[PDB]
Paper text:
Adult individuals with Down syndrome (DS) develop Alzheimer disease (AD). Here we report the structure of Aβ and tau filaments from two DS brains. We found two Aβ40 filaments (types IIIa and IIIb) that differ from those previously reported in sporadic AD and two types of Aβ42 filaments (I and II) identical to those found in sporadic and familial AD. Tau filaments (paired helical filaments and straight filaments) were identical to those in AD, supporting the notion of a common mechanism through which amyloids trigger aggregation of tau.
Type I Aβ42 filaments have a crossover distance of ~30 nm and are composed of two protofilaments packed with a 21 symmetry. Type I Aβ42 filaments, representing ~50–60% of the filaments in both DS cases, were reconstructed to ~3.2 Å resolution. In contrast, type I Aβ42 filaments and type II Aβ42 filaments are formed by an Aβ42 isoform ending at residue Ala42. Type I Aβ42 filaments have been previously reported as the predominant type of filaments in cases of sAD with abundant parenchymal Aβ deposition in the form of core plaques, while type II Aβ42 filaments were found predominantly in cases of FAD (AβPP V717F and PSEN1 F105L mutations), as well as in other neurodegenerative diseases, in association with parenchymal Aβ42 deposition in the form of more diffuse deposits. In the two DS cases, we observed both types of Aβ42 filaments, present at similar levels. Our cryo-EM study shows the presence of type I and II Aβ42 filaments, probably reflecting the presence of parenchymal core plaques and diffuse deposits in the two DS individuals.
Author numbering:
A (entry chain E), B (entry chain G), C (entry chain I), D (entry chain C), E (entry chain A), F (entry chain J), ...: 9 to 42
The structure:
Amino acid sequence: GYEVHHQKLVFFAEDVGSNKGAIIGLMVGGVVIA
Amino acid sequence: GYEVHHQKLVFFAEDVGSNKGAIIGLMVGGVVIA
Amino acid sequence: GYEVHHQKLVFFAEDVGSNKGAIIGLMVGGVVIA
Amino acid sequence: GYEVHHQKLVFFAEDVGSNKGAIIGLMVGGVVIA
Amino acid sequence: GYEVHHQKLVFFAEDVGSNKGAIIGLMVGGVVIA
Amino acid sequence: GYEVHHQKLVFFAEDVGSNKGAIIGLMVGGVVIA
Amino acid sequence: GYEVHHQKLVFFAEDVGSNKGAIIGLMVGGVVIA
Amino acid sequence: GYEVHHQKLVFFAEDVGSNKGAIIGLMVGGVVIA
Amino acid sequence: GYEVHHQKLVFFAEDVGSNKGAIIGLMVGGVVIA
Amino acid sequence: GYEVHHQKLVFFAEDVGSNKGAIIGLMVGGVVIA
């Protein structure tokens, strides 16, 4: 018998304020210019 | 017997205020200019 | 016997206010100019 | 009998303020110019 | 009988302020220019 | 001065033959039974 | 002066033959039963 | 002066034959039963 | 003056045959039952 | 003057045959039951 519970993944846990750049959770490939 | 419960994935957990840039949860490929 | 329950995926959990940029949940390809 | 509980993964635990660069949780491949 | 609980992984535990560079939690491959 | 060119994203680069299952490029939510 | 060129992202580079299961490029959320 | 070129990301470089399970390039959240 | 070229990331370089389980390139969160 | 070239990252360099379990390149969070 197996169980997994109350597992969490959070990228940004708290607030984001006044960014003038680039904020990305998960990026796969691509180009980011900030 | 197996179970998984109360699993969560959150990119942005708290508020986002006054961004003048680019905020992306998940990006695959593409170009981001901020 | 297997079960999965109460699983959630949330990109933006809290409010978004006064953005003057670009907010994208999921982006695949494309060009974002902010 | 096995169980795992209250396991968490957090990239950014506290707030992000006034970034003018690039903040990425998870990056796979790609180019980041900040 | 085995159990694991209250295990956590945190990349950035406290706040990030005014970055003008590049902050990445996990990077696999890719190029980062800061 | 910045430029990005000849960037491509391809889900299936070569041919698909005689599938009796389910082939999906991008899936968001939903249920797939194959 | 910055440039990025000839960048590619490919999920399946070669052919797919006779699948009786499920092949998905990118999956976000959802349930896949194969 | 900076440049990046001929960068590639490939999930499956060669052919996939006769799968009766589940093949996913990128998975974010969700449940996969194979 | 800086340059990066001919950089590659490949998850599966050669062929995949007759899987009856689950093959995932990149997985973020979620539950995989094979 | 700096350059980096012919750099590669490969998770699975050779073929995968007849798996009845779970093969994952990169896993972040989540639960894998094989």
